[PDB]
Each structure stands twice: as C-alpha cells, then as structure tokens.
Write a protein that binds this DNA or RNA. Structure first.
Ligand SMILES: [K+]
Ligand SMILES: [K+]
Ligand SMILES: [K+]
Ligand SMILES: [Mg+2]
Ligand SMILES: [Mg+2]
Ligand SMILES: [Mg+2]
Ligand SMILES: [Mg+2]
Ligand SMILES: [Mg+2]
Ligand SMILES: [Mg+2]
Ligand SMILES: [Mg+2]
Ligand SMILES: [Mg+2]
Ligand SMILES: [Mg+2]
Ligand SMILES: [Mg+2]
Ligand SMILES: [Mg+2]
Ligand SMILES: [Mg+2]
Ligand SMILES: [Mg+2]
Ligand SMILES: [Mg+2]
Ligand SMILES: [Mg+2]
Ligand SMILES: [Mg+2]
Ligand SMILES: [Mg+2]
Ligand SMILES: [Mg+2]
Ligand SMILES: [Mg+2]
Ligand SMILES: [Mg+2]
Ligand SMILES: [Zn+2]
Ligand SMILES: [Zn+2]
Lengths: 97, 127, 25, 97, 202, 91, 212
RNA sequence: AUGUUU
RNA sequence: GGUGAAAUUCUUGGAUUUAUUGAAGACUAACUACUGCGAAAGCAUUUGCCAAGGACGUUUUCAUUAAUCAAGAACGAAAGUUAGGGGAUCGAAGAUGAUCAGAUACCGUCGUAGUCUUAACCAUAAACUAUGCCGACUAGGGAUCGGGUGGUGUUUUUUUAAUGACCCACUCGGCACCUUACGAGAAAUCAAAGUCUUUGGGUUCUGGGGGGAGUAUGGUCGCAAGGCUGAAACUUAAAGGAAUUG
C-alpha cells in the first residue's frame, strides 16, 4: 500500500522530511511528489500546494497525522510533510490518483 | 355487490371477542364478547358462548347493513400463547351460519421477533 | 437437608461468627 | 447412571444454547432440549369447512393455514402426551412416529 | 467566575458599520480558538454553529437554546447540558425539544441554538471533599452557603425551630398556597421518600 | 520506588474525607492533570487550565472540553450524531 | 337508547387509481356536524384490501395493500398507496426448515418525493438432481445475494414514482430481476418482495392525487 | 384440585 | 382481566376490543439442524471499519525451535458490589387475593433491587462429555461441515470455456452418528472408558470408608458478599456405585 511504497522509498530512494527542506526542494525543482499529513495546518498545506502548483509537483494527502507519517517514513519523530527527490525502485511516483 | 366489514375475532383463553368493524376499522359495529352471553365466569371462552356472541353480532350487523365480512382471527399473541382460543371456531361457525358472507380469512396473531421476556419465570408455572 | 441449603445456613453462621468476632478485639 | 447416551438434549460441540420458553408453562428450556412440534392446521378445522365454502363470496377460495411452532418443556410435553415414556431400548429410536 | 462552563469570545463583523462586534457565547465542547463559527438560517450543521431549531434535523443536539426567537439563549446553558430536537411541526412552525430536565417543550422554529453540548461536562462528578472547596465555589456565586438547618434554630427564627429535641414537629411538605415565612421544607411536594423505579411520568 | 500502594495523587489528603471519596477524587484528578495529544499539532502538550478549557503548550491552541477530560463520551457521541445528521442532510 | 347508527351515513372508498378496480367497498361515519366534521373523521382511514380482491385474479391472494384516504370528495374516498405486506399464512408457508432464509431491507426515496422501506425475502432451493436434503447457502453467497437484492431494489426505486413502483410490484418483475441476477449465486426458489412500508409522506399534492 | 403420621 | 374454580384488579372519568400515529427500553422469533466458530465462559438482524483464527493447498522458509507443566498470569455464565446513564418487559424482597388446619409457598395481581449499558470489582456454577493434554496403533459404514483433487458428469450463460449450484469418487481436518465389538468394564456402557497381573510412550492435577467439614484457625485476595489454602478433637459399620426381581 501507500505505507509500503513510502517504506520502499525511505530504504532505497532519496527524500527530505520537514517543511523547510520540502519547500527548498520545491523551489529547487527536485521534488517529484510531496505528501502532506492530515493534521498539517491548513495555511501551511495551502502554501505547499501553491509551491507544488508552481513547480508542477504532485501532491498526495496522507490520511494520517504527523505522528503516523513519521511512523510510515520509519522515523521516531513527527513529520508533517515528506518530499520525494528520487523514487528509487518504487512505484509511488506513477501509482497515484 | 356486497357490503363488507371485518370480523376481527380475538379468541383468547378465558374469553372470545367477536368485533365486526368497517373496512378501515375506525368505526365498529356491534362488538359482542363471549362473556356477555354467559354468566359462569368460566364459560366465557366456551364454544357455546362464542356461538351466541357471534349470532348476536351477526344479527346486529344485518340490521345496520353489513352483508359480508372479511375474517381476521387472532390469539392473545404477544408472548403468551400464539394459539387461538376454543371460541374462535364457534364464532366463525355462527358468523357463517347466520347469513353473513365470509371472505379473506387471515390469522393476525401478533408474533414477536423474540421480544418481551415471557411471564412466569425461568421455572415456569408450577402446577 | 439439601446440600445447597446446608451451605447457605453455614454461610449465615460464618457471617454471624465474623460479626461477633469483629465486635470483640 | 447416565440415562441417555448423549444427553436428554442435543448439544455436542455447542457448549451453550440460547433458551426458549415453554408454550404451556413458560419454563425456560434450552432450545436444543425443548420439544418442538410444528402445528399446521386449517383455519376451519374439520366441520365448518363446508359452511365456510358455502358462505364464501369467492369460488375456490383455497382457505389458508395457521402455522405455529410449539416449544415444550419436558414436564409439559410429558403431561400433555406430546412425548411418552418409552422402554429402555425404544428410547434409542429417533425416527418420528 | 461563578460558572462551570467556559465562555467563548467570538468576533463578528458588523454588517452595517466597519467595526468588530465581540459576542460572549457559552463554549460548546470541541469548540477551539481560531474556529470559524457560522450563525444563521443558512449555516451548516457543525458543532459551534448557531442554527434555527427548524433548520436542524430531528435528533440534533443543541445548546444555549432560545425560548423565544431573539432572546439570545435561555435553555441548556450549564456545563454538560444540552437540548435534543425530537421533531418539527412545519405548519405553524414549531420544534419539539427535550430539555436537560427531561421536559418536552414546543418552541418556535425560529429560535436559535448552538450545535453541540455545553463544555465542562462531568463537573459535578468530583466530590468537593472540603468545606473550603464549597466556600470557594459559592464565594464567586452568592451568599447562600453555609446553610444552618432550620431545625437547629429557635422558633422565632424558623418554623422548624424549637423543641426539646431537634424535629420538624409538623409535616415538612408545605402547600403551594402557603405564604412567605411558611414555605420552608418541601414546597408543594407531590411525593416524598427515597425515589424507587422509573422517572418521566406521563 | 513506589511511594504509595493505592492512594496515588490523593496521598495529599492523608486519612481524611473517606477512602471512597478519595478514590473518586483520585480518578478525576488523574484525568484532569493528565497530558493529552493535541489534535492540531500532534504533540502530547494539552493540559487543563480552568475546568473545561484545554490548552496546548505548543501551538497555543485552546479547545473547550470536559471539566476533567478533554473530550467526554457524551461529546464524542454528539459529534458522531452531528456528523451523521449533516451527512444525511447533505445527501 | 341512542342508536348511534341512525346518525351515520355511508361513503364509498374509491380507493385505487390504477390497480385494476376503482370500487373496493363502503365505510360509515358520523354525519357532518359543527364541531365534528365527517370530512375530518375521514381522510386518515387506512384500508387493507387483498391484491386478489383488487386485481380480480386469485393468484394475488397474498400481498395485501394498505390504502390511506387522501381526500373525501362527495361520497368517494380517493386514496393512494400506503403500504403492502404479505399474508401471515403465505409467509409462514414459504418459511420452511432445511433451507436458508435470506432477507434484505432497503430504505430508498422514490423518484418524486416518497420514502419507502422495501423488505424482500428469498429461500434457497434444491436442484433437480440434489441428493443432499437441506441445500444450505455458504453465508457469503448470502451476502452476495443480499447485496444484489439491495442494488436491484434501490435501482427499481429512485427511478420511478410511487404509482410506477406499485405498477411494477403488481406484475412482480422485481422478483424475476432478482432471480436472473442471483441464479449465478444460488437457486433462490421463492424470491418475493414481502413488504413495502411508507415512511414519510411529502406535501399533500392534491394535483398528483387527482389521477382517478 | 387436595388428603397429615405409622 | 385471571384461574381447575375464584378472588385481588380495571370499568358509563367508557374498562377490554378496534384503527392512525408517537415514545421508551429490551430481544433478535420463524430460518435453527444430533449444523458452525471460539481456550473456555460464550457467540444468531443488515452493513461498514479494525485486527485475529482453524482447516485445506504448497516441489515456499527455519531446523528441534517441542510435549506437559509447581510458582506465576489472561479470560472466565448467572447472581452480587461501587459510581453514572437507562429503566419497556419480567421480576429475589415487599405488599396483597385464594387454598390449606396453618401456607407472609406452589397459583393470581402489583411491585423494589435486579434484568440493559459505560467505567471498575467479583472469579464462582450439574463452569459436564461429571471423561486432563500430547503421540502411535487396533473394526466396518453411511451421513454432514470446511478445503482440495478428478470426472464422456446434470444444471446456470459470455462467445470456445470458466466459475456458481448439484451428482459421483477420493482425500485432509472437524461436530457427531449407526453396527459390531478382538478388547475393556462391577455393570450401565465404551473406538475409547481398548492396546493393563502378557501390568512401563511422555507429562500435569486430584482421591484413600461415611460424617465432623470445605467447618475452626492462620495466611492471602475482595468494598462487601465471599474466593483460594485448610485441619483436628470427636463420632460411626456401613455410606456409596451399577444392575435384578418384586
Ligand atoms: K374465562
Ligand atoms: K421544632
Ligand atoms: K426496571
Ligand atoms: Mg371473565
Ligand atoms: Mg405437575
Ligand atoms: Mg434416575
Ligand atoms: Mg455450560
Ligand atoms: Mg447542605
Ligand atoms: Mg447545615
Ligand atoms: Mg439552639
Ligand atoms: Mg413560628
Ligand atoms: Mg407550621
Ligand atoms: Mg435542645
Ligand atoms: Mg415406619
Ligand atoms: Mg432473525
Ligand atoms: Mg451455519
Ligand atoms: Mg497453578
Ligand atoms: Mg455476569
Ligand atoms: Mg399446590
Ligand atoms: Mg468448583
Ligand atoms: Mg469437575
Ligand atoms: Mg475419607
Ligand atoms: Mg442404585
Ligand atoms: Zn412447560
Ligand atoms: Zn498544539
């Protein structure tokens, strides 16, 4: 599922965790897809959406909160947004929508 | 070609009701019970009392103008018996034999979906 | 006597003994 | 001793069976133990069938039946003779009469 | 102060003059700061929104319910209390509601209520545990505590006063038609003693 | 070490007020002094102010709640009922 | 010493609009007075009439039809469909041992304004060459059958008015549709729409009522 | 329907 | 109304009955079976979500990781306890009507706690198959549940075929059943209660005539009711099991 693809990207691909690194990757154009936690504040989610619209980056809305997103990306801290730089050997980039 | 009422025979134990009403049931015509036709306090459910009550009900119905009746027979129902009393058959006999026409006999005994824990206790009535 | 009622009488006796022992100290 | 090879009931591999109330005395008896008889009677039992066919306004009315499942406790079934005391060998006969 | 339920300060825009209008609502449980509250006939069925009683479906749980339209809230205002919509009478528009006391009331369908239950529920479940805690409770409500028993007074002070033993002497159930100075005890009591069985007589 | 066997936070009350009352008070004091998860920032930083007010030390968001818990079971049931009725009204 | 039947006048329940027959019977009520109108005493009465007595065909002896008086118009009670139910004798006759009983209930809105609850019943059946004596379903065939029946009922309703739904219930085309959609799951000998219940009426709509 | 002891 | 018959009870404030609605809580009839799942207690309306599980199939993987288990833990019908909610029905208590010689019992009418639910206790039942668990072997047979395999198979349409349902045969696992028992038992009966004087596959628990007595005491658990552990003095020639005839 989505958690499995996220784990595959964590173990094999390239990624950034957190708002500042995600926005940096979006403005650098090296973000392939951004996953936004459900409990992310709506203003921050809207600004990330605007950056992804400007950079033509896909947006996936994680059904869980930041704790669940951190667990899915295999970390022990809260993650409000994940940016995928290189999908690696994982089908997260094409098997969406 | 006929004027139809509803017989609504409630044949419990200890009593039988012969209660002829209109097609809707809002208005009733000559509701007679088996106890009104006997004074023993135990024959009120008896077939003779039911026959007399139904004969009186039919006589009063065919002065109002009821010529035929659809038949709805019920027991006590609920959680008590499910079995019609001894007087329902005699009441139907008298209704059919007093000149009234008979139509659409149905058993309308109330049947629960396993509700209303029954009276008597788990050891039942001890006789 | 029925064993159940013997048990009930014994339990009542035990309760009475417990009360009379508790009242002393 | 043990009167009946399985039990005075029908419960093996079940453990617990919900009770039903005897139609005669309202005693609680497990459903697998209660004596169950289907009563499928003509509304007009035997005598007034002719009278009701004569008084009926419909030719070939095909009068209905009353269906009622009767659940009896052992004591009430024996008292009302729905079941009877049988010989020791005749008890081992489950075919209905 | 003096209220169990918290209050919510909700700021609206004045539709007729350029300024802000602060209103003091009784906060419903789940209402949070920064939340948008919608009030009117066309507002959505969300907790904290103010709706006419007729505009909500049967079974809706409301609070701060107006007894009359425009009274700005009369019913189900204490902490943890709420009013249940049980049905509407669209002709001669009225809404049937159940009050916290269990009483059924017929209210105009234009009367408003706040969706949800009043915050602060479960307050009376905690024992006060202390005369000091009762003191601080009533210090910010009114001088109604502590209470001297009338039976512990002298006859001049109370109907229950006097006697060589502390006792009422006559029935404590007092007629509704009694006058001031007599209405001490159980006024117009339909019944007395420990309540056993079910409530909601009909 | 475990300083008290059962009184817990009610050890401050000593031997007063009765064991049943101390137990009833203990349950709700534990509830009211517990730290709860912030539904907005996901942090275990929500603590009670006055009764019915629960504020997150992070993100400074305060929510109206129960007197001693953030969400009463009655309020959760009412939230579910309102969600269901809103869904029925919209469709 | 009053004889309440002297002051009662008769009315004719011209109950249906399309079933097969306008006349269903007569009913009596107290004559109109100042503080008690006969039109008020009427116009709420529900009459239960056999579908066979409505269609003239004896193969409708079950499926009684409830009709509520919607308007009293000069000794003619113009009613409309209020609900239908199978007879107790028929239902008990179909409910037999050594077979699986499947029941499905849906709450649907008709095309125009009407809210109905549809109860359908079905029974597993023996094949032609079955030796097995019970022919039970596997509790997932039951779920698939219930899903299919619910879809069929919710498609037959929501695409027709109350009158159209009644005129589709009389031929029992929904039963045949269920049989055709379920014959690939389980035989289902005795598919029937055992009950239609009217949950909420819309605005009176005397114009729509005035069709008979 | 009930009828106590040996 | 209620009963075998009555009475308490309701009733021209219209009782009971009938019709259209509403509300409340409980329960899940018929389908329901010598049928299913679960360690047991238990589990029977639909649908959605959440994890779980046996059996089957497997030319997938590890390789002894296993069996039974003092101490120690989880669950544990009903009743009962505490605090809320709910309280329709039935209903320990209580009140009453009748019988009786007495009947604050059976029967009748009410009716509190309870019955329902949340959060905590309680840990007991003829908690039974009165049959510990694991393993091997020793008759026959037909049903049935779940999985699988095969068929010139019947039936359902998609357009070859396929599944779906059904039949036949086999197979694994399960609830059981019928006959016969080489065998076992005191017998009733038992495919295990057999493979025991031809006595030993492994392991846990329990009993030593009947009472006193599951009592006293101590310990321990429980808010309590009580639970677990548990004597002795003393007393007694029987108590008991199965079966036979009256
Ligand atoms: K009688
Ligand atoms: K005094
Ligand atoms: K109760
Ligand atoms: Mg009588
Ligand atoms: Mg007897
Ligand atoms: Mg015996
Ligand atoms: Mg058991
Ligand atoms: Mg005081
Ligand atoms: Mg005082
Ligand atoms: Mg003084
Ligand atoms: Mg004075
Ligand atoms: Mg005075
Ligand atoms: Mg003094
Ligand atoms: Mg002797
Ligand atoms: Mg059912
Ligand atoms: Mg099954
Ligand atoms: Mg142990
Ligand atoms: Mg229990
Ligand atoms: Mg007796
Ligand atoms: Mg034991
Ligand atoms: Mg045992
Ligand atoms: Mg011994
Ligand atoms: Mg013996
Ligand atoms: Zn019985
Ligand atoms: Zn926060």
């Amino acid at each position: 599922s989505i958690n499995q693809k996220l784990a595959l990207v964590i173990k094999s691909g390239k990624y950034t965790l957190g708002y500042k690194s995600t926005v940096k990757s979006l403005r650098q154009g090296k973000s392939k897809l951004i996953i936004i936690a459900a409990n992310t504040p709506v203003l921050r989610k809207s600004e990330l959406e605007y950056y992804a619209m400007l950079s033509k980056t896909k947006v996936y809305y994680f059904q869980g909160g930041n704790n669940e997103l951190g667990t899915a990306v295999g970390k022990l801290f809260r993650v409000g947004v994940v940016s995928i730089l290189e999908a690696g050997d994982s089908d997260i980039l094409t098997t969406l929508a | 070609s006929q004027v139809f009422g509803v017989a609504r025979i409630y044949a419990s134990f200890n009593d039988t009701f012969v209660h002829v009403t209109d097609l809707s049931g809002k208005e009733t015509i000559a509701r007679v019970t088996g106890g009104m036709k006997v004074k023993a306090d135990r024959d009120e459910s008896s077939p003779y009392a039911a026959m007399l009550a139904a004969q009186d009900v039919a006589a009063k119905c065919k002065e109002v103008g009821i010529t035929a009746v659809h038949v709805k027979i019920r027991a006590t129902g609920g959680t008590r018996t499910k079995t019609p009393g001894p007087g329902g058959q005699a009441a139907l006999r008298a209704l059919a034999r007093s000149g009234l026409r008979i139509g659409r006999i149905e058993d309308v005994t109330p049947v629960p979906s396993d509700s209303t824990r029954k009276k008597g206790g788990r050891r039942g009535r001890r006789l | 006597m029925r064993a159940k009622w013997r048990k009930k009488r014994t339990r009542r006796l035990k309760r009475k003994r417990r009360k009379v022992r508790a009242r002393s100290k | 001793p043990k009167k009946r090879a399985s039990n005075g009931r029908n419960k093996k591999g079940r453990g617990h069976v919900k009770p039903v109330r005897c139609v005669n005395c309202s005693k609680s008896i497990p459903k697998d133990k209660a004596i169950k008889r289907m009563a499928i009677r003509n509304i007009v039992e035997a005598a007034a069938v002719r009278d009701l066919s004569e008084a009926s306004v419909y030719p070939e009315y095909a009068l209905p039946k009353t269906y009622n499942k009767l659940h009896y406790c052992v004591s009430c079934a024996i008292h009302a003779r729905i079941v009877r005391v049988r010989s020791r060998e005749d008890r081992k006969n489950r075919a209905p009469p | 102060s003096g209220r169990g339920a918290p209050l919510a300060k909700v700021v609206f825009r004045d539709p007729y003059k350029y300024r802000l209008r602060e209103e003091i609502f009784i906060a419903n449980e789940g209402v949070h700061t920064g939340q948008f509250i919608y009030a009117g006939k066309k507002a959505s069925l969300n907790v904290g929104n103010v709706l006419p009683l007729g505009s909500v479906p049967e079974g809706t749980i409301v609070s701060n319910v107006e007894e009359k339209p425009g009274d700005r809230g009369a019913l189900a205002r204490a902490s943890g209390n709420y009013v249940i919509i049980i049905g509407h009478n669209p002709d001669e528009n009225k809404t049937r509601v159940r009050l916290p006391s269990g009483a059924k009331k017929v209210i105009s369908s234009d009367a408003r209520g706040v969706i949800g239950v009043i915050a602060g529920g479960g307050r009376v479940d905690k024992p006060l545990l202390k005369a000091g805690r009762a003191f601080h409770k009533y210090r910010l409500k009114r001088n109604s505590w502590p209470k001297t028993r009338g039976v512990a007074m002298n006859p001049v002070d109370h109907p229950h006063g006097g006697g060589n033993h502390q006792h009422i002497g006559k029935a404590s159930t007092i007629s509704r038609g009694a006058v001031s100075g007599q209405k001490a005890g159980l006024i117009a009591a339909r019944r007395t003693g420990l309540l056993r069985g079910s409530q909601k007589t009909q | 070490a475990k300083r008290t066997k059962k009184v817990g936070i009610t050890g401050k009350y000593g031997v007063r007020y009765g064991s049943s009352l101390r137990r009833q008070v203990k349950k709700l004091e534990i509830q009211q002094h517990a730290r709860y998860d912030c539904s907005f920032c996901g942090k275990k930083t929500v603590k009670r102010g006055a009764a019915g007010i629960w504020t997150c030390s992070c993100c400074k968001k305060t929510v109206a709640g129960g007197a001693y818990t953030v969400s009463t079971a009655a309020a959760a049931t009412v939230r579910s009922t309102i969600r269901r009725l809103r869904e029925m009204v919209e469709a | 010493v009053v004889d309440p039947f002297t002051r009662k006048e008769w009315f004719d329940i011209k109950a249906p609009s399309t079933f097969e027959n306008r006349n269903v019977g007569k009913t009596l009520v107290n004559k109109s007075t100042g503080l008690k109108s006969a039109s008020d005493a009427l116009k709420g009465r529900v009459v239960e009439v056999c579908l066979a007595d409505l269609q003239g065909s004896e193969d409708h002896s079950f499926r009684k039809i409830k009709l509520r008086v919607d308007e009293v118009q000069g000794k003619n009670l113009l009613t409309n469909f209020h609900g239908m139910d199978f007879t107790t004798d028929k239902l008990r006759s179909m409910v037999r041992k050594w077979q699986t009983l499947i029941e499905a209930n849906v709450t649907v809105k008709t095309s125009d304004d009407y809210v109905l609850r549809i109860f359908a019943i079905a029974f597993t059946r023996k094949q032609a060459n079955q030796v097995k004596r019970h022919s039970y379903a596997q509790s997932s065939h039951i779920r698939a059958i219930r899903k299919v029946i619910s879809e069929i009922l919710t498609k037959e309703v929501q695409g027709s008015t109350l009158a159209q739904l009644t005129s589709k219930l009389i031929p029992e085309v929904i039963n045949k549709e269920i049989e055709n959609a379920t014959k690939d799951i389980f035989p289902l000998q005795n598919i029937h729409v055992r009950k239609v219940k009217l949950l909420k009426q819309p605005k009176f709509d005397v114009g729509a009522l005035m069709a008979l």
